[PDB]
Amino acid sequence: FQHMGTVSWNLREMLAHAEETRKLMPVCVETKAIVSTIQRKYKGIKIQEGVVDYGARFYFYTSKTTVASLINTLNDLNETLVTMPLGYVTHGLNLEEAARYMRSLKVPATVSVSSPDAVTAYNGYLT
Amino acid sequence: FQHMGTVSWNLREMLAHAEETRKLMPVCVETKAIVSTIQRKYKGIKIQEGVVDYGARFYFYTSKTTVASLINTLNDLNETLVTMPLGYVTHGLNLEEAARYMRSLKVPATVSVSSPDAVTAYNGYLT
């Protein structure tokens, strides 16, 4: 998977990278800490499902969208991502099963996990 | 980040340091000026992706490999590096976003930037 690599970026780093690069950043609208940060950082943003390009370029989704459906949608968008492992926590998945879904991503992505130790754990599950 | 330090060495100085120390030196094969210099200093080299130990010890990569993936690979190799800021220009990144990715390196590294002024800028971005 030369098109995906794994870092440990907090939300401020992810947003700063996304603002500069305009890489697409998926955001689960049920994750209050993240939505709150976005609403305060980009005053006036109208959060709605799908692509919202305002401050940064977001793909807003609900966890009622199942992970493989989200990933097919993102594959069709054909944009480079900055993302957390999809389904992890939001869909009740552990890190290993989120990685299993992430194997279906065909677009380039930077994947952010909680800690440097999670980087090696995640990459081992992915490969 | 005590395991990384920043200098301003031109390519000839980087190659001389790499030749003596056997530190691993990442090289983007799309950067034609660098590849040509390497082919001229180390006549007969067979450039191919991955580790090539000929004259100096190189890690040749394509910019189709995403920066975080390259860094994941270099961390797994566990060799000390002499390197330019990864992703800078080659992946369309500015110096600040390259530095953001370099925070993920776990192996010791000497990072060489284009001028003494860039040393100041890069260190501020890294931290």
Curated annotation (Swiss-Prot), chains A, B:
Residue span(s) of domain Macro: 5-127
How is this protein's activity kept under control?
Answer: Inhibited in vitro by GRL-0617.
Q: Where in the cell is it found?
A: Host endoplasmic reticulum membrane
**Reactions the enzyme catalyzes:** Thiol-dependent hydrolysis of ester, thioester, amide, peptide and isopeptide bonds formed by the C-terminal Gly of ubiquitin (a 76-residue protein attached to proteins as an intracellular targeting signal)
According to its record, how does it sit in the membrane? Multi-pass membrane protein
What's the domain of life for this entry? Viruses
Quote the subunit structure annotation: May form homohexamers. Interacts with N protein.
Function statement = Responsible for the cleavages located at the N-terminus of the replicase polyprotein. Participates together with nsp4 in the assembly of virally-induced cytoplasmic double-membrane vesicles necessary for viral replication. Antagonizes innate immune induction of type I interferon by blocking the phosphorylation, dimerization and subsequent nuclear translocation of host IRF3. Also prevents host NF-kappa-B signaling. In addition, PL-PRO possesses a deubiquitinating/deISGylating activity and processes both 'Lys-48'- and 'Lys-63'-linked polyubiquitin chains from cellular substrates.
Q: What is this protein called?
A: Papain-like protease nsp3
Q: Which organism is it from?
A: Severe acute respiratory syndrome coronavirus 2
Q: Which part of the complete sequence is present? A: 1369 to 1491 of 4405
